[PDB]
């Protein structure tokens, strides 16, 4: 239940498109703890973890600070292309 993560600054419809072509998904993490962060995550890792621990299992997200306990509130997914396009991580209470 682990994802290593990158933080992203501002983005455009070319930087973002190149990431999501490379196979890195953008996401945010917001909720109970920290304020909000915009992140890159790896599509394959995220897929494996969700096939492992379920559609709503709990996840440890290593944003770059220490791991944050999160779950998936929503995911924007691209049919005709079969890839994930954006993710929302709801940092849960304790």
């Amino acid at each position: 239940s682990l994802k290593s993560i990158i933080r992203q600054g501002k983005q455009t419809r070319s930087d973002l498109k190149q990431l999501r072509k490379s196979g890195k998904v953008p996401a945010v993490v917001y909720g109970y703890g920290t304020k909000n962060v915009s992140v890159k995550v790896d599509e394959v890792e995220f897929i494996k973890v969700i096939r492992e621990v379920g559609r709503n299992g709990v996840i440890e997200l290593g944003v770059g600070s220490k791991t944050i306990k999160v779950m998936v509130a929503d995911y924007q997914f691209d049919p005709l292309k079969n890839q994930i396009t954006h993710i929302d991580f709801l940092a849960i209470n304790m």
């Binding site: 969700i50 559609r55 997914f77 049919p79 005709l80």
Partner: protein
Amino acid sequence: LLPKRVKYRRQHRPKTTGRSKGGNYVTFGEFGLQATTTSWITSRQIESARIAMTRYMKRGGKVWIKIFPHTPYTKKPLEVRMGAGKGAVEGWIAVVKPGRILFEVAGVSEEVAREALRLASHKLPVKTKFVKREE
């Protein structure tokens, strides 16, 4: 397949650019048919495709059509100079943009579903692919 009643029989013919406003994620059944390209689809094509699937499958089977031709279209009488109004109705169309699910099917295995929706794909003006549900 027609609507029973409509306010305006002579409409503008719809837009074909863009992508689906919806009808993309397979919802009812287990398997579905997904357009990769844009065209129009009629009562006639739908009846044919549905017949094809329902014959290929035994009485064991359940189908959900996911489109309906609300929009009519016109054609003028034959051998007529242009202008002088707008022609009568000759059909009814559902527009299809890539993404959208045309048919959904439940009560079978994936091989049977593949062959049925394959048989149907050849009776539409659209390139299709075979879809399963998501997570």
